[PDB]
Structure formats: C-alpha cells, structure tokens
Amino acid sequence: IKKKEKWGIAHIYSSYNNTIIHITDITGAETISRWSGGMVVKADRDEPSPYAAMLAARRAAEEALEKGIVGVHIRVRAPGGSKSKTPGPGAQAAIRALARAGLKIGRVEDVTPIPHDGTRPK
Amino acid sequence: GMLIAITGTPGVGKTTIAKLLAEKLGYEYVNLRDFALEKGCGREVDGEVEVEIDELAYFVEKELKDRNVVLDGHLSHLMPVDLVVVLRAHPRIIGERLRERGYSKEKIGENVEAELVDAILIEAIDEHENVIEVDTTNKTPEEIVEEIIGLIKSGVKRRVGIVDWSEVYDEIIPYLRLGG
Ligand SMILES: Nc1ncnc2c1ncn2[C@@H]1O[C@H](COP(=O)(O)OP(=O)(O)O)[C@@H](O)[C@H]1O
Ligand SMILES: [Mg+2]
Ligand SMILES: [Mg+2]
C-alpha cells in the first residue's frame, strides 16, 4: 500500500483594498496559516498589489509546509465589476506563488460571493 | 431631477438610511423591489422576485427621470442614477443581523464574505464615476445621514477605499464558509 499525504484548503480573497490567504485543514476547523497583503508590505497603496498577494501567499505556503501540509485545494473569492467582469491577476498570482513555494495544487473552485436577497437578477 | 442610489450588502442598513435620508432631504423614497413589481418586470415566486436588469434600468430611466428620489436596493447601483452611496459595515455586524433575519448559515456566510471582499463597492465603481462610500460601524442612522448630506453639500462626488475588512478577518471567521 502506497499512500501518504495531508491536504489543506487555501481560501483566497481578492478585495478592493487587499488580498487574504487563509490556509485551513480539509475540515476547515483548524487554521494552519493566515496572511494578508497588509502584513507583508509597508505602504497602504501597495496592499492591493498582486506582488503583495504573491508575497503573502509565499509566507502562507511556507508556514503551511512547515506544519506538514503537502498540498492545497483552492477556494477563490475574486469579485469583479458587473459591466466588465475583471477579477484581477491577484488570485492567480497568489495560486502560482503557492505552487512555487513547493505546495501541490488540488481542485480550484471559484466561490466568489454574490450578495443576495431583495430583487433577484438573472 | 436628482436620483440617489443607496446600496450595499444585505443587512447593512440600506432601507433605514434611505427612508431617513429621503425624509430629511425632502425627496421621495422608492424601494427598487416594489418598483420592479409595479412595472411588471418583477415576477414573485415563493417568495423571491426575479427581474431582468436591463428592463429595470429602462423603466427607472423612464419614470423617475425627472424626479428627486432616494432609491433603495442592493441592485440600485446597476440603475442609471446620478449618485451612488455604498454603505459598509463590519462583516460581523452583517452576520449577526442576517442571523436575526433567519437566513441560512450558507447565505449568511456568502453575504458576510460579500461584505469582506467589497463586492458591491467594486460593482458600483465599475458602473459609475460618482460613488460615495460610508462606514456605518458604531454610527446611528442620524449620524450617517448627516454625514452623507454633508458630503453631498461639500460637494464631493467620489470617495472610495475607506474600509479594509481584511484587518478584522479573524473576528468574522465563525460566519465564513470554510467547511470542507
Ligand atoms: N445605523 C444603524 N444603527 C443600528 N442599527 C441599524 C442601523 N442601520 C440599520 N440598523 C438595523 O439593521 C437591521 C437591518 O437594516 P435594513 O435597513 O433592513 O438593512 P438593508 O436595508 O441593508 O437590508 C434593522 O433591524 C435595523 O434596525
Ligand atoms: Mg433593505
Ligand atoms: Mg489598511
């Protein structure tokens, strides 16, 4: 029997002002690592930057690996406009940074939240 | 005419603020959902109302043109208005309020996340140049309305980027959808 590995979930949030990478275990009850753009960069104006997203993802991935996480499934929240739907390069940049740090990448799902109740659009 | 849209994540206080503001401004309050029902765009099925947005924009443009109106709804920023006001609140507040409304755990979670990632704000900025963001946290409706009228009278047509909820992320973890 050849089988191994411990997998987590990387919750990735791309907002207007920032990026968050929150890594949990598969159950989602335990927090493995939590990093945002605001934690890795000095200036407010650089917090939304995809470079900051990559750096935060790098820190998160390192922390997760040291705690024994071999790979992660990704759950992405990447809001974009209603006119032009532009999520931005940030979430993808974060995912790539997770891979480059040595994490395996599993399923990638876009869970981007849609506010609802009131009138219902199509 | 002056058409002002009041939008934001469900639970943030759109209706409260819109009514108080319309009264204090001497404008007329219009709830977008009900308006959608009147023009026959909206169809109500058990109990949600489905509409086609382009039609609603068409009717809003047509009927209200021409008027002084405070428009209340989370779709209001998708309408052809003169000014958009986006209300923000600490996502925990959203969670508690929607929790009191009886929403499902998943629905609460999605709307709380929606506030976390600034979804409505991003939509509004994509749709309009004139967007005023207002943080409702630890404020009374009175203070919020006077803040809004104050900014309009300044006048300021655009203010955005005033909240970053990533800083409060841990506090909202119990409401989020993290489950495997
Ligand atoms: N500034 C505020 N301070 C305290 N409570 C508020 C405030 N604004 C709204 N609320 C409360 O929050 C709840 C939801 O407000 P509501 O206007 O229905 O939000 P929305 O219209 O965005 O769904 C109401 O029960 C209301 O009493
Ligand atoms: Mg409302
Ligand atoms: Mg900040």
The Å distance, Cα B15 to ligand 2 centre, comes to 4
The Å distance, Cα B11 to ligand 1 centre, comes to 6
Q: How far apart are CA A35 and CA B89, in angstroms?
A: 22
Instruction: Select from B6, B7, B16 the residue to mutate for testing ligand 1; criterion: most ligand atoms less than 8 Å from CB.
Output: B16
* CATH number (domain holding residue B12): 3.40.50.300
Nearest CA-CA distance, residue A27 and chain B, Å: 5
Cα Rg for chain A, rounded, in angstroms? 15
Test A38 with B177 for CB contact under 8 angstroms. Answer: no
Total domains in the fold of chain B: 1
Angle (CA) B11 B14 B15, round 5°: 100
Check CB contact of A47 with chain B, cutoff 8 Å. yes
Helices (H) and strands (E) in chain B — how many of each? 7, 7
Partners of B4 in the beta sheet? B70, B83
Q: Which of B36, B107, B122 lies closest to A81 in CB terms?
A: B122
Which of B122, B133, B171, B173 to probe by mutation at the A interface, max A CB count within 10 Å?
Answer: B122
Is residue B72 helix, strand or coil?
strand
SS (H, E, C) A70-107: CEEEEEEECCCCCCCCCCCCHHHHHHHHHHHCCCEEEE
Q: Which of B50, B118, B161 lies closest to A120 in CB terms?
A: B50
Angle (CA) A61 A63 A64, round 5°: 65
Q: How far apart are CA B148 and CA B134, in angstroms?
A: 8
User: B158's torsion region: left (phi>0), alpha (psi -120 to 50) or beta?
Assistant: beta
Task: Confirm or deny that B13 is annotated as ligand binding.
Answer: yes
Partners of B83 in the beta sheet? B4
Hunting for tokens 């925990």 — which residue is that?
B92
Which residue's CA is the closest to the ligand 1 atom numbered 6? B13
CATH 3.30.420.80 is held by the domain A1-122: yes
Test B123 with A81 for CB contact under 8 angstroms. Answer: yes
Partners of A36 in the beta sheet? A20
B117: containing domain: 1-180
CB A32, CB A63: distance < 8 Å: yes
Q: How far apart are CA B79 and CA B65, in angstroms?
A: 12
Partners of A11 in the beta sheet? A22, A75
Method: X-ray
Q: Are strands B68-72 and B28-31 parallel, antiparallel or unpaired?
A: parallel
